Amino acid sequence: HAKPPYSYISLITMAIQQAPSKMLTLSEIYQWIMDLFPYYRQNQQRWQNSIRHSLSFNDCFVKVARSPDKPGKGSYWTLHPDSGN
Amino acid sequence: HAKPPYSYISLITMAIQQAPSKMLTLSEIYQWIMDLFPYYRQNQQRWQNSIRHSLSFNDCFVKVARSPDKPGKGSYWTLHPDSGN
DNA sequence: TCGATAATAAATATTT
DNA sequence: AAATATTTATTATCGA
Ligand SMILES: [Mg+2]
C-alpha cells in the first residue's frame, strides 16, 4: 500500500489510545502500526528509528516502568495528562 | 476539547474514508471534523481556511462535480487513486 | 541535525 | 452576498 498521511505523533497516539489501559511497549507500537498500515511492513529499520525518536523527543509521550513481577523488554509508553485524554 | 495531533491532510482523509460514498462536500468535511473533535468548534474562520488550502494544494484530493440535476454550493471531494488510497 | 513538509495568513478567483 | 476554490509567501513543525 501507499504511505498513510499520519504523522509519527499521530500514529503513536492512535496506538496508545486503543491499547488496553492506554499503555503499550515500543514493540507493541511497531506491531500495531504494521498490523493496520501495510506500507510500514517494509523499511522497518528506518521508520522504527523515527518512532523511537518521536517517543523520546516529544513530551506528550511518557515512559512508564514495568511491574517488578512481569518485568520485561522496554517500558510502557503512554500519553501525558495535559494532552486530550 | 484539546487539539488532536492530526494534520489537515489526515483529518480530510479520515472524513472522506468514513463517508458511505467515499466522497464529501466541503461543509460535510467541516461538520465531521467538528462533530468528532470539539477543539475545532472554535476559530472556524482560521482552520476552515486551512482545510480549503489543503484540499486544493494537495493532489491526493480531487474535486468531483455535482450532478446537473442536483446543483448546490461546492463539489464533492474524494481521494485520488494515483495517490494510493 | 539538516532537509522536507505542514500551516498560517492572505489576496485572488470561481461559482450559486 | 456568500460559500467555495486557487494561489503565494512565510513561519512553524516534522522526519530521515
Ligand atoms: Mg497526522
Author numbering:
A (entry chain C), B (entry chain A): 168 to 252
What's the publication's text?
We further determined the co-crystal structure of FOXA1-DBD in complex with p53-DNA (5′-AAATATTTATTATCGA-3′). The crystals of the FOXA1-DBD complex with p53-DNA also showed 2:1 stoichiometry, and FOXA1-DBD1 bound to the major groove of the FBE1 site through helix 3 of FOXA1-DBD, which is similar to FOXL2-DBD. However, FOXA1-DBD2 bound to DNA at an unexpected position distinct from FOXL2, where helix 3 of FOXA1-DBD2 bound to the major groove of extended DNA formed by crystal packing, and formed apparent protein–protein dimerization with FOXA1-DBD1. In FOXA1-DBD1, His220 (corresponding to His104 in FOXL2) made contact with the base of T8′ and also with that of A10 via a water molecule (3.0–3.3 Å). Asn216 (Asn100 in FOXL2) formed bidentate hydrogen bonds with the base of A10′ (2.9–3.1 Å). In the wing 1 region, the backbone of Ser242 and that of A5 formed a hydrogen bond, and the side chain of Lys240 was directed to the major groove of DNA, interacting with the bases of A2 and A3, and water-mediated interaction with T16′ (3.3 Å), constituting additional contacts between FOXA1 and p53-DNA. Distinct from FOXL2, the protein dimer interface between the N- and C-termini of FOXA1-DBD1 and FOXA1-DBD2 was observed in the structure of FOXA1-DBD in complex with p53-DNA. Tyr173 interacted with Gln184 in neighboring FOXA1-DBD molecules. Importantly, Ser174 and Ser177 in FOXA1-DBD1 and FOXA1-DBD2 formed Mg2+ coordination with their backbone and side chains. The converged dimerization, which refers to the opposite direction of FOXA1-DBD molecules on DNA, was observed, involving unexpected interaction between N-terminal parts of each protein, which was mediated by magnesium ions.
